[PDB]
Design a protein around this ligand. Sequence first.
Ligand SMILES: *[C@@H]1O[C@H](CO)[C@@H](O[C@@H]2O[C@H](CO)[C@@H](O[C@@H]3O[C@H](CO[C@H]4O[C@H](CO)[C@@H](O)[C@H](O)[C@@H]4O)[C@@H](O)[C@H](O[C@H]4O[C@H](CO)[C@@H](O)[C@H](O)[C@@H]4O)[C@@H]3O)[C@H](O)[C@H]2NC(C)=O)[C@H](O)[C@H]1NC(C)=O
Ligand SMILES: *[C@@H]1O[C@H](CO)[C@@H](O[C@@H]2O[C@H](CO)[C@@H](O[C@@H]3O[C@H](CO[C@H]4O[C@H](CO)[C@@H](O)[C@H](O)[C@@H]4O)[C@@H](O)[C@H](O[C@H]4O[C@H](CO)[C@@H](O)[C@H](O)[C@@H]4O)[C@@H]3O)[C@H](O)[C@H]2NC(C)=O)[C@H](O)[C@H]1NC(C)=O
Ligand SMILES: *[C@@H]1O[C@H](CO)[C@@H](O[C@@H]2O[C@H](CO)[C@@H](O[C@@H]3O[C@H](CO)[C@@H](O)[C@H](O[C@H]4O[C@H](CO)[C@@H](O)[C@H](O)[C@@H]4O)[C@@H]3O)[C@H](O)[C@H]2NC(C)=O)[C@H](O)[C@H]1NC(C)=O
Ligand SMILES: CC(=O)N[C@@H]1[C@@H](O[C@@H]2O[C@H](CO)[C@H](O)[C@H](O[C@]3(C(=O)O)C[C@H](O)[C@@H](NC(C)=O)[C@H]([C@H](O)[C@H](O)CO)O3)[C@H]2O)[C@H](O)[C@@H](CO)O[C@H]1O
Ligand SMILES: *[C@@H]1O[C@H](CO)[C@@H](O[C@@H]2O[C@H](CO)[C@@H](O)[C@H](O)[C@H]2NC(C)=O)[C@H](O)[C@H]1NC(C)=O
Ligand SMILES: *[C@@H]1O[C@H](CO)[C@@H](O)[C@H](O)[C@H]1NC(C)=O
Ligand SMILES: *[C@@H]1O[C@H](CO)[C@@H](O)[C@H](O)[C@H]1NC(C)=O
Ligand SMILES: *[C@H]1O[C@H](CO)[C@@H](O)[C@H](O)[C@H]1NC(C)=O
Ligand SMILES: *[C@H]1O[C@H](CO)[C@@H](O)[C@H](O)[C@H]1NC(C)=O
Lengths: 318, 318, 318, 172, 172, 172
Amino acid sequence: DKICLGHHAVANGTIVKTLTNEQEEVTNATETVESTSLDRLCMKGRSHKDLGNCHPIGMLIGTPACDLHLTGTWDTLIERENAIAYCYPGATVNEEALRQKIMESGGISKISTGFTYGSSINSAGTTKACMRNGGNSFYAELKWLVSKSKGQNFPQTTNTYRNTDTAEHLIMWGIHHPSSTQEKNDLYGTQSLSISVGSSTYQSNFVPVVGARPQVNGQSGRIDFHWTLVQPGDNITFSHNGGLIAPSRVSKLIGRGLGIQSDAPIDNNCESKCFWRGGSINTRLPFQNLSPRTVGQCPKYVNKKSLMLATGMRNVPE
Amino acid sequence: DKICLGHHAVANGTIVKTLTNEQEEVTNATETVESTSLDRLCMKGRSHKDLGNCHPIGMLIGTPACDLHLTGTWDTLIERENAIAYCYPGATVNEEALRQKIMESGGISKISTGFTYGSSINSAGTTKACMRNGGNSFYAELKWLVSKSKGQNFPQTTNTYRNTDTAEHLIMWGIHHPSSTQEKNDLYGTQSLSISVGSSTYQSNFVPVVGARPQVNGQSGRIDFHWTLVQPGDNITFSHNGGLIAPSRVSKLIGRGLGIQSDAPIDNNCESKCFWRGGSINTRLPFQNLSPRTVGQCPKYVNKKSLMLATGMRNVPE
Amino acid sequence: DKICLGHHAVANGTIVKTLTNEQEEVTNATETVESTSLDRLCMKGRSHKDLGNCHPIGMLIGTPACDLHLTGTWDTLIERENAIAYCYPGATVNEEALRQKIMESGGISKISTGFTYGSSINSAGTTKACMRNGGNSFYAELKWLVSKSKGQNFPQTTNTYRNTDTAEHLIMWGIHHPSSTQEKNDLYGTQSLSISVGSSTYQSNFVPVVGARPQVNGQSGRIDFHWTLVQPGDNITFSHNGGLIAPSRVSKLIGRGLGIQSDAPIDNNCESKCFWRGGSINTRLPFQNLSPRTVGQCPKYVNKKSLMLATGMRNVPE
Amino acid sequence: GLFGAIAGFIENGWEGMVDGWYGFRHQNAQGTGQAADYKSTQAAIDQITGKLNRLIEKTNTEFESIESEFSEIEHQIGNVINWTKDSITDIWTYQAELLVAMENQHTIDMADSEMLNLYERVRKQLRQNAEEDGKGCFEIYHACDDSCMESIRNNTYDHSQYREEALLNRLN
Amino acid sequence: GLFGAIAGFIENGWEGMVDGWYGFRHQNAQGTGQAADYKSTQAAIDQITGKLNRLIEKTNTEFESIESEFSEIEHQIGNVINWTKDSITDIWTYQAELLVAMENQHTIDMADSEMLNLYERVRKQLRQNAEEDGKGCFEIYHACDDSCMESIRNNTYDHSQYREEALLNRLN
Amino acid sequence: GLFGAIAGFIENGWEGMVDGWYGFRHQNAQGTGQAADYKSTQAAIDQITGKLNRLIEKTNTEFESIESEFSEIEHQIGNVINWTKDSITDIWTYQAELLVAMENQHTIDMADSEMLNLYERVRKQLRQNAEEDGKGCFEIYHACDDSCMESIRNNTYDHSQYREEALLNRLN
Ligand SMILES: *[C@@H]1O[C@H](CO)[C@@H](O[C@@H]2O[C@H](CO)[C@@H](O[C@@H]3O[C@H](CO[C@H]4O[C@H](CO)[C@@H](O)[C@H](O)[C@@H]4O)[C@@H](O)[C@H](O[C@H]4O[C@H](CO)[C@@H](O)[C@H](O)[C@@H]4O)[C@@H]3O)[C@H](O)[C@H]2NC(C)=O)[C@H](O)[C@H]1NC(C)=O
Ligand SMILES: *[C@@H]1O[C@H](CO)[C@@H](O[C@@H]2O[C@H](CO)[C@@H](O[C@@H]3O[C@H](CO[C@H]4O[C@H](CO)[C@@H](O)[C@H](O)[C@@H]4O)[C@@H](O)[C@H](O[C@H]4O[C@H](CO)[C@@H](O)[C@H](O)[C@@H]4O)[C@@H]3O)[C@H](O)[C@H]2NC(C)=O)[C@H](O)[C@H]1NC(C)=O
Ligand SMILES: *[C@@H]1O[C@H](CO)[C@@H](O[C@@H]2O[C@H](CO)[C@@H](O[C@@H]3O[C@H](CO)[C@@H](O)[C@H](O[C@H]4O[C@H](CO)[C@@H](O)[C@H](O)[C@@H]4O)[C@@H]3O)[C@H](O)[C@H]2NC(C)=O)[C@H](O)[C@H]1NC(C)=O
Ligand SMILES: CC(=O)N[C@@H]1[C@@H](O[C@@H]2O[C@H](CO)[C@H](O)[C@H](O[C@]3(C(=O)O)C[C@H](O)[C@@H](NC(C)=O)[C@H]([C@H](O)[C@H](O)CO)O3)[C@H]2O)[C@H](O)[C@@H](CO)O[C@H]1O
Ligand SMILES: *[C@@H]1O[C@H](CO)[C@@H](O[C@@H]2O[C@H](CO)[C@@H](O)[C@H](O)[C@H]2NC(C)=O)[C@H](O)[C@H]1NC(C)=O
Ligand SMILES: *[C@@H]1O[C@H](CO)[C@@H](O)[C@H](O)[C@H]1NC(C)=O
Ligand SMILES: *[C@@H]1O[C@H](CO)[C@@H](O)[C@H](O)[C@H]1NC(C)=O
Ligand SMILES: *[C@H]1O[C@H](CO)[C@@H](O)[C@H](O)[C@H]1NC(C)=O
Ligand SMILES: *[C@H]1O[C@H](CO)[C@@H](O)[C@H](O)[C@H]1NC(C)=O
């Protein structure tokens, strides 16, 4: 003569937080914050270039390490720690901007400048800091011009690159800073050194630093690189009388790509959309507590070990 | 002997999303995301200035395109695509910061510097690249100083501007970089050129750089612009012997204003508080999917085409 | 025969906002936005340094007003309005980046450069602008180098600092900018002045700007400061023939600390974790309408005077 | 749903109802009739109106441009700006989606609630003179003319008047 | 409201009830009385407490200053910071308002449900011995003295004891 | 809780019930039996599934790096980036915590309501043939065998069939 209504329960439920109760026991609950990383770079479905010990910028000027990466196409570009950009010591002005540009791109083409030099110029300057096949070499995309006759003055020289393509090119050049006035004379002469670089949307001048400093890779001299974009149809002129490291090629950045800085090994058998220094994050969860520095399409970083979503009623045990 | 209770329904309602259901049918729903823009700039109750062909920086140096815009007051300032700043080819250091200052402002006054020059200086230099009234002219607010007699050394000169106002003044000046040494010699002489500038909060040196470069508006030379703020009560001194493009007037920025970049036509009969490249957003809706780049007081931009807010119960058809 | 169920009410209820009602009356409510500030810096539990007169950059270079703040340790650094960095007129390049580094730190140590100079150099150059004990002095961590003999050529000089510690050191130097060529000739000789600074990760040239300019603290000359980091095991060389304000001590930033900008008086009997220009915010509330600019662990700033949260039922009076 | 009426024990809505959200159908000696309840309809509509007013309240925060439309930004500052803007947009998109989903959940359940509140108000009004059919109707155990029907809708029905007749019909 | 009791069928609150949120008024020959219910009052109070505790739990993110109070910031970076700070402030202002509007809606409805639950608890205890008056009162069809009234308040009322008398009266 | 059933007037859950969320226990002449209710269980599970579906829908905003892992970032811009990233993290942390706290409050109350909806359905099912005991059971005032119990569970119980026997036992 009796019929009772009820609901299920379990022997040990799980604790969740509600708006009213920090400690509400429910039948079932599930994690909303990802705590697990895969410690590899999941590269499945991606056309990727691992730069090894080649630095993004190295790709533009032609450091020996980057000889296998002077041109190419990718949808994912992978930078490693301690990668080499500069065999000969120096830095690029606005380095981080350029690094990010290269890392936002999906490829690099190279186009020759066609720069020829008079018989009173030696275009074949090399160094022990950039070695190719056990011999003194130089950046593949550049030429180190010095006076043909040791000590005798370097002539006023004009070189113009014309961009005849339908897209903007990226041009780079270096300024050599000697380590002494003596070295400065042998290479370029006594005259004051003026390097004017001008397009229709850019101009600038450079005076080369002569002064003693530490040896880096056996060299006290420095080569500092500078860059600018050349628009379709526009010409860029190099008016120079010594100390210019002139481009033998220019670069063109193709398409869009995802830039990754990581030292986690490549895995072509998992796909992922989210990456960080320590590998890949592929979860369906909306939140993530592994790292604030991720790239791609990522779950949002939160400062929480755990957040449990109730997937069942209150647990009221027998 | 019967009474029955019920609710209304419609033939077919609208779908909305709930927490527990993505395809929930209700009797009525309303949009929360604005999809529509007014393709004009709504300027009712606004003291506005349409710069047309004049670039904000051209207001301060007095480019011909900007002749109607050397002074003024406004609470809204409108910049158009392809506006002209430089008639004679060149560029300004810290250009984007300067452009933003002008666009954050509510007006421009001009104060004469009072600079005068000895008879061996010709302050009337002009160029066919800055045309006025079918004749050669120059930047209204500046003077191109050259040696009165061709080929002779420009004299050592000192010009001090004294800010007697209670407000800070924006002083601009130019440095001319010739296209050749012969040009450089004709204009200022064979002497080494030096321009030093000094206030009590700023100092710098500038050297004109001769160099071959492409023609822009028929000119291979360049004039590069520099600016600094002179405090009330402070003075600013120029020491120069050739290459200085000296100010005949300085600017004072007045009050606050909203800067807008757009090519939408101005409408004096509608009002708005939210503008974008494509025009005006007049909505009561809290969200907007037209553009991430908006100015004023705007609905928040969202990555959604549509978001329906239920305004009625569950629709349960007969 | 009658038993009635009911709830309590109060005479004077409180208005709160709900999802559906802007003007809802409840039996009680509590504030969620902090409007109250303590007009004191609450320093209980904190090893703090009040810089008083002293600007954080002055700690590095040794302005007299910073004599009590050349070394030390703290968890909390307090900067005041009108603090002095430059007794002798000038400024630091990348000043704000430097200021921020010092205010992110928990202390400062000082290490000697060991620099010495031949008898043709007077290294004890001083100025009336940097007074100590009623006498003309100079920045405690730097040396003003001028020719021993007036008008004589400042010799070609090299000084190298070597970092033998296991941390990076912060090195600073200055460039004197004379107010005339006569003064420049008197101090450094008639030679062209060049200052080159080179480490393994940094190099730059510097030339003294000479020209007339306003007297600041009685001086038309200027000393601008420059800085860089020298890595563990690295060397930094200075090559100079006059114009270098050379370091005698370099700095080491210790640990982490919290930087506060305020003129509020210190109080050692209250404790706080949130600070602003006007003092300390001590609240359990999650929001505050005091200021958008706070430091520490702070309630979030909201554009709201008041947000009442109901702590009772609907008030339904009789 | 939450309250069991709409999409619950009441089978469906009435498309014939055009002057109300909630109401009454009757069937007695003199046939059928239909009338909308003004009170519970206005209770629900006022709450909807409240939500719509919250939706449109403006913040007067004026924003300047930090991106040039007509000239190129320096690449690094440009990337920071892009990162910040995209982050801000992900937050608002999320907020917007959450707000609407939450409000919708609530307005559906609020509408259900009002239907139950009308039902309950009627159930108690009739006291012992009627019974529930489980499909949202009340089976009345007396002669209830159009005039009696109006009093139930008018909330002035007096069970005392019919209890004697009704209880006899119920206990049979 | 959602549960129909507070500002619903219970017509108003009792201003002279100072020792509880919910409670009882009775009426019988011996007189009238008023006592608060403890269990439902704490049920409501403890849920309010939970909310207060959530409101006051503090994060630990240390923020440094990115804006000098006493010197000039470079104009372009100053503008990025301003835009970003104002964007964050708009988010928190909106969040604060959403939080409080939402919590408020919830606590009001929660308070209503606890009142309803107490009503339902009494109704089931009284079983067939009483009838709902629609104003939140129960009319009791047997002699219920102060002591009888007390057992109802204390959840120890035994309906089997009064059933015979009460059923006879209900049928009159 | 909100709807007064789970951890309300129903004392505890049944661990023995492994084949469903809501159910029946009965006792009559032929002993005892326990069966799950499909429709109420599904309604609850389906609503849970809807929330998890919402939880896993992916925003496709592609972010780039603005912070080098391998080289030094200029200090000022590095501080702005850090301020911004931490601000965003505080927002998301806050969002996540509120989302789940609210969601959990909702699923608990939704489940509670589905218990109450099942209870109310059966109450109307039995009409005048049974009485509530206050603990989630109905005392049936006639002989109700296993075929009779099943018809309550299956929602095919006709009350007219037992009304006469039931009412007699209810009076005595
Ligand atoms: C921060 O974020 C902004 C906004 O996303 C970036 O600016 C965009 O940059 C992209 C380049 O990645 C631009 O896309 C290019 O558009 C060109 C067309 O020009 C117009 O496009 C629309 C017309 O509606 C306008 O928005 C715009 O004003 C232009 O007038 C195309 O020619 C390009 O296509 C090329 O790419 C394909 C790859 O599929 C190649 O095969 C070909 O080379 C092809 O021609 C390209 O799609 C986009 O216009 C920019 N948007 C805006 C609003 O400016 C910033 O660059 C970014 N900043 C940093 C530092 O990263
Ligand atoms: C990024 O955002 C910050 C904060 O909003 C801006 O800093 C503010 O800049 C504005 C200028 O637009 C300053 O407002 C001015 O304040 C003057 C008085 O200053 C004193 O009082 C304020 C009180 O809060 C103190 O902050 C300050 O330290 C001083 O003690 C007023 O006199 C000014 O009025 C002007 O307009 C009137 C019209 O009514 C004219 O008649 C006058 O000529 C006058 O120019 C003006 O309102 C404000 O002081 C700054 N605030 C802070 C906290 O620093 C940044 O500039 C902004 N950066 C950008 C866009 O790059
Ligand atoms: C923006 O934020 C980033 C990330 O938070 C920040 O980079 C971090 O800087 C801290 C220093 O504040 C670095 O922490 C060090 O790392 C090593 C481990 O590799 C620790 O063992 C160190 O311990 C030292 O810390 C003490 C201070 O309490 C020192 O007195 C002593 O030297 C200790 O041995 C130390 O914690 C950390 O490497 C980075 N983190 C990352 C992920 O890069 C960056 O500096 C911020 N940017 C700006 C401009 O402020
Ligand atoms: C010689 C004399 O007494 N001249 C009187 C002027 O006083 C001097 O003016 C000169 C400029 O002409 C300098 O400002 C002198 O300033 C000092 C100083 O105190 O700062 C003196 C220091 O010894 C000197 N330091 C070094 C290392 O040389 C310093 C520097 O030369 C400059 O700061 C470099 O820029 O200057 C000052 O004493 C006086 O101005 C004038 C007006 O009444 O009367 C002159 O007789
Ligand atoms: C800027 O120039 C003016 C005018 O030369 C200076 O004003 C002088 O102030 C002094 C007091 O310091 C007074 O003797 C005179 O009123 C002014 N001098 C002369 C010769 O007229 C002003 O001091 C200069 N520089 C600043 C303020 O830095
Ligand atoms: C650049 O070079 C071309 C080809 O030599 C020449 O016609 C002209 O000087 C320049 N043209 C343009 C479009 O810049
Ligand atoms: C710095 O100088 C010392 C002493 O001359 C030298 O041995 C050491 O290798 C140098 N270090 C670097 C990094 O150049
Ligand atoms: C939805 O339509 C109804 C008519 O059914 C109308 O009254 C109402 O205005 C509409 N909703 C909104 C938000 O405008
Ligand atoms: C409201 O008053 C009640 C007592 O009536 C108290 O419990 C509560 O803390 C009060 N809150 C505030 C903010 O005063």
